Design a protein around this ligand. Structure first.
Ligand code: ZXX
Length: 163
């Protein structure tokens, strides 16, 4: 029952590959549904064409700011922000998909994909999914990051949807 969504990643416009995610709607249905709908675009906005604005090798890839493209924007399907649904799931290692935020109960559309175990974020960021196929593509994206997170090539979600 858990939805599978995919991102087709491009690097300076050149196709790199596909990442697919399992969304844990059985544990975090509201958070899963937000990401699922932003990945299909069915509400009229979402992730297609957006970029990954911060990539830190050995930590995480951050994206989902489809309104300001720099970490300051994005919005949920429910409004600007929604609650931390729960913290049942933990940041157990690479491939974990979790919500970025600016404080308690401020989820929008920004998310991050862990490339390492990030247990210090447990209880503060809502984990809602995990990479299914294409962790090697996330590892490839990682190489275009830097210590301060600035990317050396433009990493975009060229296409996305539900599988
Ligand atoms: C260098 O680390 C980050 O940039 C982190 C990685 C996880 C996702 N994330 C956020 O949720 C960060 C908070 C954070 C968490 C952990 C470490 C940090 O330095 C900063 N938040 C943001 O980027 C948001 N808010 C602000 C005020 O920056 C944006 C979603 C509207 N950014």
């Amino acid at each position: 029952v858990n939805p599978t969504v995919f991102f087709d990643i491009a690097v300076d416009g050149e196709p790199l590959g596909r990442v697919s995610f399992e969304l844990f709607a059985d544990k975090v249905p509201k958070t899963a549904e937000n990401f699922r709908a932003l990945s299909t675009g069915e509400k009229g906005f979402g992730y297609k064409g957006s970029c990954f604005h911060r990539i830190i090798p050995g930590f995480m890839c951050q994206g989902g700011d489809f309104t300001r493209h720099n970490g300051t924007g994005g919005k949920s399907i429910y409004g600007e922000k929604f609650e931390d649904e729960n913290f049942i799931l933990k940041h157990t290692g690479p491939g974990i998909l979790s919500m970025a935020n600016a404080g308690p109960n401020t989820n929008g559309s920004q998310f991050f994909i862990c490339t390492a175990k990030t247990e210090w974020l447990d209880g503060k960021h809502v984990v809602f999914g995990k990479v299914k196929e294409g962790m090697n593509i996330v590892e490839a994206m990682e190489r275009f990051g830097s210590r301060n997170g600035k990317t050396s090539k433009k990493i975009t979600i060229a296409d996305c949807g539900q599988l």
